[PDB]
Amino acid sequence: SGLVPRGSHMMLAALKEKLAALKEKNAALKYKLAALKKEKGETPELAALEKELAATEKELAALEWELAALEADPNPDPAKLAALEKKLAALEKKTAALEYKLAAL
């Protein structure tokens, strides 16, 4: 099997920390968003951003279950780990853009 088990073990740990950092970063945008909702009202723009945040929070919770099941697998599928890394990478980019967009409002 070579370095396949070691690569899966290292990628599992990297994705676990990546996901936990995304959960904290996305939850912190709730407080800034609610502050903007209080200051400006629940505008159509702020309402749409709240749905994005809620949807991102919902997906991170589901991907966390997927990561939990892969961590319990004695031989996790490297293809599932690679696909999970790609999803988290895209969620990182959406969260970074939402953070800059909330700071600009």
Author numbering: -9 to 95
What do the authors say?
Here we describe the combination of rational and computational design to deliver three-helix bundle (3HB) peptide assemblies and single-chain proteins with control over topology and thermal stability. First, we garner sequence-to-structure relationships from antiparallel 3HBs in the Protein Data Bank. This gives core-packing rules, including layers of hydrogen-bonded polar residues, which are combined with surface-charge patterning to design complementary sequences for acidic (A), basic (B), and neutral (N) helices. Next, AlphaFold2 models for both designs are used to seed computational designs of single-chain proteins where the helices are connected by loop building. Synthetic genes for these express in E. coli to yield soluble, monomeric, and thermally stable proteins.
Given the underrepresentation of clockwise topologies in nature and the associated design challenge, we initially prioritised this configuration. To do this here, we used MASTER to search the RCSB PDB for loops to connect helices in the AF2 models for the clockwise, apCCTri-BĀN, and anticlockwise, apCCTri-BĀN′, topologies. Next, ProteinMPNN was used to optimise the loop regions of the single-chain models while keeping the helical seeds completely intact. Based on pLDDT and RMSD, two BĀN and one BĀN′ single-chain designs were chosen to test experimentally. CD spectroscopy of all proteins showed that they were highly α helical and hyper-thermally stable, and AUC experiments confirmed they were monomeric in solution. We solved X-ray crystal structures at 2.10 Å, 2.15 Å and 2.20 Å resolution for the two BĀN- and one BĀN′-based designs, respectively. This was done by molecular replacement using the AF2 models of the peptide assemblies as the search models. All confirmed the three-helix bundles with up-down-up topologies for the B-Ā-N/N′ helices. All had consolidated hydrophobic cores with knobs-into-holes packing between the core Leu residues confirmed by Socket2. In addition, water-mediated hydrogen-bonded layer of Thr (A) – Asn (B) – Thr (N/N′) was present in a clockwise design.
